[PDB]
């Protein structure tokens, strides 16, 4: 039966559920605070129709549905946003071309468009028919028809039902309240601890180089990029800075980094922090293997050990030599790769670890524990991190990893980057290369309108200004991105606080839509394609302005737009705002004051919050932080006229001279 | 531990098995007598390396494999041959396009070219990693390389071991000895019972005819095939037969068939079997509805009722039905469709059956049940059946169905008669529509050379001779497979007998060829595809001779041919004989003579059984068959020599007048 443990949300215990299970992987606790601030609502089931039980080693849940109901998530998918009438797989996994519940982070969480949403908590792999099932005894069991006279006979009758197959002896479930679709994920993002609030230095440009690059090589980059009046914050390292990789050391190699310790500092005294590579695969040659042996599984990775880091005997030998051998010298975070799949790189569910737990578990989870214990040893420091990840699941909402991968459609990219808002976890739609100018601007366009502005470049070398047809265009685009950190800042910090989605779906407000997705509160960002000149764009309800001339763009309907190849079509609510900071190429640093113009769009008075602290450490979690509020509206000459509330006591203050501007003229 | 329970065969039990399994569920009795007459062999592992564990609710296998080894089987695939280095998870399905073990047998077989097989007994959905696990304690664990240096570096180690892993607390398994990889074919097909000796009437035309047809319109199309002198034996009924379809009421609709009993007789008395397209799921019109209804699962398909077959309740009125409405008026055999999926179309995992079997063994065994008590009640009637099944699996080899599908593509038809050698089932690569005469004539000229020569029209309205360009043709091939009867009675009597798969791959004498199949025990068929003016053949060692004109061909090498649009290449081994009937336009009775005439091809001496009895009873069970032993060679001045072993006295002796015809001049 139901608890109500917070506001919104409750949760039940079927059978005997396991003792692993994806939040405790994740070591997730809930933001009990922000939680309790939710409105009560009431059980989103009302009349029956649930069924929880536990037959034949298996765990059976069915929940009703209703005839106008969708559903959205089931993970992060590519190609479908709309999940009724599906059929899913929920399983660790690079994304193979398809949406069959295979990929990143297949998390078991969805939400319907009544306002409710329903998690599984189990780390096994788990079965999902989304409305498909029709039962004998349904109370919407359709009238047989005769399909040898009979039109309107149908292929898939009318099912009324979400039912889940869980492969273990029981489960818990958790199901969240409204009213509203958005409500659920926010009260399930904040039981899973609310997103990771990340360092503002995590939102600059972040430039991944060749695998073979020396730190020489590394220099002569970040030069050219502070020649060449392009930002950049952090720098990723491929797996050359290894000694050894696929199977790795976890160790510099001492031809092409001689000397890491005077590396680092030399980097980080240019406003450059680094982001590493890993795979968590161990070679014979990394300095703990033999202490580490015991404690990995069955089966290799590339001929690399894979630690059991449900064990403190693996993690321990394999975390100290992070935090020794790079954290330690100034290494700023981690890529973390090929925790995901393929089935024929990873190891097989046949394989054993030495802590018992089956490989299923490990295979949906691993990705979530390497997040978890690399992320600890950060926060031990007193010090935020942001990097990468290739795989997530339920649990992880809470961890400073962004998911990427190796797949590359820009459709399908933007797609997951809609599905991330339904599924806990982040998502970048990342440049690595490109066979024509116009798709590398576009592809930076919605990449700078993402969690991590990146040019991945492991393979080809390529840096911002590599295409010159687009060049000046890129620049502004990357500039672009600098100005409207204090927006995605404090966008970042209502994930953080609030559990919102920084990157939404349409329709989310407080038919299927694949190519439209909010970015923080205010702007709906709509993504050309290489080789479209134009597109329509669906707008909500209530007025909207575009983002480049404030001019008025829409209301409630549909535009055809053919924006050029200068710019991605975005357009800002009405009374919609965007502070601006100049255009730094390098994020601004703690003690450091930085003027704004606030950007107000159309004439319904405006209201932003804006997060201020010091961008870097925890001591937010000791209350140093604040939310300044931002009001604009036009008087009534139609002149701009702004407030900022005042600045706090003993509070960081960051924030320098503010102006503002109607954009909307 | 491993008991040796016949010749070559050797049987484990590992846990505690389920009290569900794949040869229970089809009630497969083992030929004692053939498989006693097989060489005992020495067990196929002799070095270790084989571990049968249970733990953590699962039982996991492991076979190892040599540096040599390839692998086949694993069911019904059709883009796939060579099964080493492939990932699946077996599972009763329609094939969905690509090669996953979602198919329509997804029998639980591999077959080694060292001469071993393996099979394990589960009625579960089962995972197989056939050389992918690469283990850190492997006797072969590959040198870490470090992919930053090393051009050598491999992205899919070398791998030792077939894994295997069943969903349940243990498995039965067996093993089968060689010498060669079609020994332990024969052997496990024994082990089922043998191949369904089919009736002579089995083996000519079937024409299915349009969902809509009439009683009158099946009588004009009988009357058209015969006008124009076209081979039929059978003609396939479909949906419209029955007063209601999609769900049915199995029960023969009043206005297309008003008559049942004088249509049938009709049919028959012109030579004419009827076959009665069937799906399972029942309609709340059909007669026994409320009978069975306790008797059926949680979830319909298309609206339909599933009974639970394992159940007696269920079993006796439906096929009483069947016995009563539709055998004893004298219907010769059934199609039994959609048995198999999709997962939107049948019942979902979570579906409960009132017998208490998981919906996921009824999954993989329901076309199983309706082949086993639909054929009983053929039997008890001392009576031979031969129709269709849209799914299988292990523990089948013995009943009378042919598997068919809706996919189409020509290659990949070809590709799963193949592999139905390895899979202990027959396919009929079928033929339908076409958009080219070229087309139509090239899928009928493999569709000859299969276990059912076949149009199914149920929604082309497609005749032999709908195609004038190609009309000819198509009728000479036609023609050819009642010619061939005799080639294909005594290949059928060995898959009954001895276990020998009549149609199977390449290298299964007594790279990767996924478009040449052998045909009997003589004959290599390699199948043009439409677009195509040439291909090549590849010729195992040995002399081979052209099927039409007798002339040599080739030894152990590759032939560029170009056939023409009137010919499949057929190449006959040397010494090869295909005895040849009249070409009848209906089978032979039991009480007919019939004049044969053998035809020999190449120098080397040559032997042929031939096998005879009356062709539609089960009286060869009480032994009234014969084996009549022909030899034929060419004497000193090149003109043929031949024999045939004389006449047992009691038995049925169908052979008339025999000549013989040295086909290499």
Same mark, same amino acid.
């Given at each position: 039966?139901?608890?109500?443990?917070?506001?919104?949300?409750?949760?039940?215990?079927?059978?005997?559920?396991?003792?692993?299970?994806?939040?405790?992987?994740?070591?997730?606790?809930?933001?009990?605070?922000?939680?309790?601030?939710?409105?009560?609502?009431?059980?989103?089931?009302?009349?029956?129709?649930?069924?929880?039980?536990?037959?034949?080693?298996?765990?059976?849940?069915?929940?009703?549905?209703?005839?106008?109901?969708?559903?959205?998530?089931?993970?992060?998918?590519?190609?479908?946003?709309?999940?009724?009438?599906?059929?899913?797989?929920?399983?660790?996994?690079?994304?193979?071309?398809?949406?069959?519940?295979?990929?990143?982070?297949?998390?078991?969480?969805? @939400?319907?468009?009544?306002?409710?949403?329903?998690?599984?908590?189990?780390?096994?792999?788990?079965?999902?028919?989304?409305?498909?099932?029709?039962?004998?005894?349904?109370?919407?069991?359709?009238?047989?028809?005769?399909?040898?006279?009979?039109?309107?006979?149908?292929?898939?009758?009318?099912?009324?039902?979400?039912?889940?197959?869980?492969?273990?002896?029981?489960?818990?479930? *958790?199901?969240?309240?409204?009213?509203?679709?958005?409500?659920?994920?926010?009260?399930? !993002?904040?039981?899973?601890?609310?997103?990771?609030?990340?360092?503002?230095?995590?939102?600059?440009?972040?430039?991944?180089?060749? +695998?073979?690059?020396?730190?020489?090589?590394?220099?002569?980059?970040?030069?050219?990029?502070?020649?060449?009046?392009?930002?950049?914050?952090?720098?990723?390292?491929?797996?050359?800075?290894?000694?050894?990789?696929?199977?790795?050391?976890?160790?510099?190699?001492?031809?092409? *980094?001689?000397?890491? +310790?005077?590396?680092?500092?030399?980097?980080?005294?240019?406003?450059?922090?680094?982001?590493?590579?890993?795979?968590?695969?161990?070679?014979?040659?990394?300095?703990?293997?033999?202490?580490?042996?015991?404690?990995?599984?069955?089966?290799?990775?590339?001929?690399?050990?894979?630690?059991?880091?449900?064990?403190?005997?693996?993690?321990?030998?394999?975390?100290?030599?992070?935090?020794?051998?790079?954290?330690?010298?100034?290494?700023?975070? &981690?890529?973390?790769?090929?925790?995901?799949?393929?089935?024929? *790189?990873?190891?097989?569910?046949?394989?054993?670890?030495?802590?018992?737990?089956?490989?299923?578990?490990?295979?949906?989870?691993?990705?979530?524990?390497?997040?978890?214990?690399?992320?600890?040893?950060?926060?031990?420091? !007193?010090?935020?991190?942001?990097?990468?990840?290739?795989?997530?699941?339920?649990?992880?909402?809470?961890?400073?990893?962004?998911? *990427?991968?190796?797949?590359?459609?820009?459709?399908?990219?933007?797609?997951?980057?809609?599905?991330?808002?339904?599924?806990?976890?982040?998502?970048?739609?990342?440049? =690595?290369?490109?066979?024509?100018?116009?798709?590398?601007?576009?592809?930076?366009?919605?990449?700078?309108?993402?969690?991590?502005?990146?040019?991945?470049?492991?393979?080809?070398? +390529?840096?911002?200004?590599? &295409?010159?047809? @687009?060049?000046?265009?890129?620049?502004?685009?990357?500039?672009?991105?600098?100005?409207?950190?204090?927006?995605? &800042?404090?966008?970042?910090?209502?994930?953080?606080?609030?559990?919102?989605?920084?990157?939404?779906?349409?329709?989310?407000?407080?038919?299927?839509?694949?190519?439209?997705?909010?970015?923080?509160?205010? #702007?709906?960002?709509?993504?050309?394609?290489?080789?479209?000149?134009? =597109?329509?764009?669906?707008?909500?309800?209530?007025?909207?302005?575009?983002? &480049?001339?404030?001019?008025?763009?829409?209301?409630?309907?549909?535009?055809?737009?053919?924006?050029?190849?200068?710019?991605?079509?975005?357009?800002?609510?009405?009374?919609?705002?965007?502070?601006?900071?100049?255009?730094?190429?390098?994020?601004?640093?703690?003690?450091?004051?930085?003027? #704004?113009?606030?950007?107000?769009?159309? !004439?319904?008075?405006?209201?932003?919050?804006?997060?201020?602290?010091?961008?870097?450490?925890? !001591?937010?979690?000791?209350?140093?932080?604040?939310?300044? +509020?931002?009001?604009?509206?036009?008087?009534?000459?139609?002149?701009?006229?702004?407030?900022?509330?005042?600045?706090?006591?003993?509070? @960081?203050?960051?924030?320098?001279?503010?102006?503002?501007?109607?954009?909307?003229?």
């Amino acid at each position: 039966n139901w608890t109500e443990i917070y506001p919104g949300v409750w949760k039940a215990t079927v059978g005997k559920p396991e003792s692993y299970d994806l939040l405790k992987a994740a070591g997730a606790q809930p933001n009990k605070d922000a939680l309790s601030k939710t409105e009560k609502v009431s059980f989103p089931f009302a009349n029956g129709g649930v069924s929880l039980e536990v037959s034949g080693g298996k765990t059976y849940l069915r929940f009703p549905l209703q005839k106008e109901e969708q559903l959205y998530g089931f993970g992060l998918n590519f190609q479908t946003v709309h999940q009724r009438g599906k059929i899913l797989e929920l399983h660790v996994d690079h994304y193979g071309g398809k949406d069959s519940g295979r990929t990143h982070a297949p998390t078991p969480f969805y @939400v319907s468009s009544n306002g409710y949403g329903v998690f599984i908590n189990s780390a096994r792999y788990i079965k999902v028919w989304a409305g498909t099932g029709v039962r004998k005894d349904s109370e919407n069991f359709p009238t047989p028809k005769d399909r040898n006279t009979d039109k309107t006979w149908s292929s898939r009758p009318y099912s009324d039902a979400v039912e889940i197959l869980v492969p273990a002896e029981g489960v818990e479930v *958790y199901v969240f309240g409204g009213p509203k679709p958005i409500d659920a994920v926010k009260r399930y !993002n904040l039981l899973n601890g609310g997103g990771y609030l990340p360092p503002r230095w995590g939102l600059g440009f972040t430039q991944r180089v060749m +695998t073979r690059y020396t730190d020489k090589d590394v220099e002569k980059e970040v030069n050219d990029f502070k020649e060449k009046g392009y930002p950049l914050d952090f720098v990723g390292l491929e797996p050359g800075w290894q000694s050894k990789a696929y199977p790795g050391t976890f160790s510099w190699d001492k031809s092409r *980094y001689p000397d890491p +310790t005077s590396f680092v500092k030399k980097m980080k005294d240019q406003g450059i922090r680094l982001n590493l590579w890993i795979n968590p695969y161990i070679s014979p040659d990394a300095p703990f293997y033999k202490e580490i042996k015991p404690y990995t599984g069955s089966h290799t990775v590339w001929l690399g050990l894979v630690p059991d880091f449900t064990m403190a005997e693996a993690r321990k030998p394999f975390f100290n030599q992070l935090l020794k051998d790079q954290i330690e010298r100034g290494v700023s975070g &981690y890529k973390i790769a090929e925790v995901d799949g393929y089935d024929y *790189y990873l190891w097989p569910d046949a394989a054993k670890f030495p802590s018992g737990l089956s490989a299923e578990q490990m295979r949906q989870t691993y990705g979530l524990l390497v997040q978890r214990y690399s992320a600890e040893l950060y926060k031990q420091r !007193n010090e935020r991190t942001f990097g990468l990840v290739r795989a997530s699941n339920g649990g992880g909402t809470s961890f400073p990893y962004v998911i *990427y991968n190796d797949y590359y459609n820009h459709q399908d990219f933007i797609t997951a980057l809609i599905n991330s808002g339904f599924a806990g976890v982040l998502w970048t739609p990342e440049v =690595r290369a490109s066979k024509s100018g116009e798709e590398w601007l576009r592809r930076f366009q919605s990449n700078v309108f993402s969690p991590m502005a990146m040019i991945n470049a492991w393979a080809s070398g +390529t840096k911002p200004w590599s &295409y010159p047809e @687009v060049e000046a265009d890129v620049k502004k685009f990357a500039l672009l991105r600098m100005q409207m950190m204090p927006y995605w &800042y404090s966008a970042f910090a209502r994930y953080h606080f609030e559990g919102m989605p920084p990157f939404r779906g349409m329709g989310l407000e407080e038919k299927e839509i694949k190519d439209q997705y909010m970015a923080g509160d205010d #702007l709906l960002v709509a993504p050309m394609f290489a080789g479209e000149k134009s =597109r329509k764009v669906v707008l909500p309800k209530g007025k909207w302005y575009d983002f &480049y001339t404030g001019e008025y763009a829409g209301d409630g309907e549909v535009l055809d737009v053919t924006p050029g190849l200068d710019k991605i079509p975005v357009y800002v609510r009405d009374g919609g705002i965007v502070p601006m900071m100049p255009a730094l190429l390098n994020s601004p640093k703690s003690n450091q004051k930085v003027d #704004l113009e606030i950007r107000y769009y159309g !004439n319904k008075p405006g209201e932003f919050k804006l997060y201020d602290d010091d961008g870097e450490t925890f !001591n937010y979690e000791k209350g140093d932080f604040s939310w300044r +509020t931002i009001r604009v509206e036009k008087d009534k000459s139609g002149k701009v006229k702004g407030s900022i509330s005042a600045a706090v006591k003993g509070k @960081v203050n960051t924030v320098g001279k503010v102006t503002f501007t109607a954009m909307t003229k």
